[model samples]
Target: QQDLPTLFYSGKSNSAVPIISESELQTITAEPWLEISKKGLQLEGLNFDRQGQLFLLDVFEGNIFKINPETKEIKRPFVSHKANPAAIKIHKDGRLFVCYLGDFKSTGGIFAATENGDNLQDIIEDLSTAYCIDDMVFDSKGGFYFTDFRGYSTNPLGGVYYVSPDFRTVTPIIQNISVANGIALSTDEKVLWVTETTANRLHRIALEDDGVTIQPFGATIPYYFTGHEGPDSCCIDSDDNLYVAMYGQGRVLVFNKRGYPIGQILIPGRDEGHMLRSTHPQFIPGTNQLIICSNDIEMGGGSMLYTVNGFAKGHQSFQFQL
Candidate 1:
């Protein structure tokens, strides 16, 4: 794997906002402006399309926006769901699978919809009680992996799950986790990486047909240590390294394939997990850039979006078209 200098976009002009604190990640030094939305919509979970368009989800507003990378043209809300939408990823079949964080009354589930926000349908439902579905990723063989951050302010049985593409079956890939949140699969599709927000740790699980076996990767700087945010959503680069969005830490923590801390990219604002205080880290399909959402707490005010220009390696995107 080739090495490249990390690139970033902060949501501010000056160093006023405390992006990083002590070992905490502060800012993406190369670019100082914080990443915000075009019309200031709360941008969360970001996915870059084959044509370089970024699909951003507004958790509070239950909406998704499509933005062109070069022009920064924000299309109308792409996909609007019933509740908080966590992550958006495209399947090879051109279907967009959206993971939702249902608010107690219902258990979170995965939704299959068109990229244009049409033909919305349920892929799976009845997740663990009050389980908020966080992030998701598809393997080369079409198996999808996801997380259930169940018990945030409620229960304590957060764990990760795996589902077939047809959505007929679901299985717990691992169990006994604390706030299982962000998740990603290694480039080789043999390993699973999961972030536990409450424990402030990332765990790696060896994948097998029966189930996933767990292993501790490393501890992440927690968000709100005294009340700080920890890791949120994450993505794997072409070389199989991980780029994780630390919500309260205000930066993206980049770890190498061997589970060693390589570097960090700082984001502006204190947008923990609410509005895009750096929620998702996605490498553009064929470019050395990463698309991130600066989601904050509110529905509107504070959130933004941006993409680092030149750092990531281009991998072939799943040719999913709506």
Candidate 2:
């Protein structure tokens, strides 16, 4: 996998060479590779450590768990919390950042903990004005970005914000996003892709070398499934292919660097009232497997996590070196 050529796109041409053609895509119906947790847990964010161990967040339990993917043994309370943890990411320097969405009238913020989940401290908790945060991504340079998913109807209030590596300043990089949900940086670190759930589309923004100035680039990538809502969270592969969790479609849609739909991996389960939402799709480091987080809705059915094989190796997060 290390020898494979990296994917490239000019953004000048609207065409792209797909890594996997539609006809070559395998329609998967097999059960989950491993059910890490049972239904009602509302499992959400997932990440991998340098050692290839899997870590995930349970929104309902407000806790983080580390799992041995091979043995299916879970180490619970890896990072226990009082507020609901929406997402988790480990920094290259061995710091773990957790996004907490506060309870009912409470304010939410991002929290930092040591690699072992100790020395917990508040990184940023004054986001009372930004409605709610959904996801986040760290750049290669140590700086990170997060998405605020707040808005309704034609009134777009959501935005994408960046926090300095020194943890000194917080700035809104993109504003007026209609429910800014999934956020991810390109493998090359030149582009940012954000999903607008309410608008049912994905927007691409080009970043300057300074990693701050952003300009609108390329056309919006429209939702592929008509009846389904927009994407939830997304992850990019080493080849720059994007794997998007179609929130209501129960599948992960694959798109190339040029924003062209190439293939998809279907999650096993009947689509329930938009709640069987397929939330996050992440590539297992140093491997070809892709694990997805999804749960059943109130309409009825059991929820579980699933995995599929034959995906390109994913881009290594900063934590990959630690």
Q: Whole-model Cα lDDT per candidate?
A: 0.64, 0.70
Candidate number with greatest lDDT: 2
Q: Determine the backbone clash count of candidate 2.
A: 0
**Model 1 TM-score relative to the real fold:** 0.78
Highest TM-score: which candidate? 2
| Runs in model 1 lying further than 4 Å from the true structure | 1-41, 77-79, 104-106, 126-130, 152-155, 209-227, 269-276, 296-301, 309-311, 317-322
lDDT for model 1 = 0.64
Query: Per-prediction TM-score, please?
Result: 0.78, 0.85
- Clashing pairs for model 2 are none
Q: How many backbone clashes does candidate 1 have?
A: 29
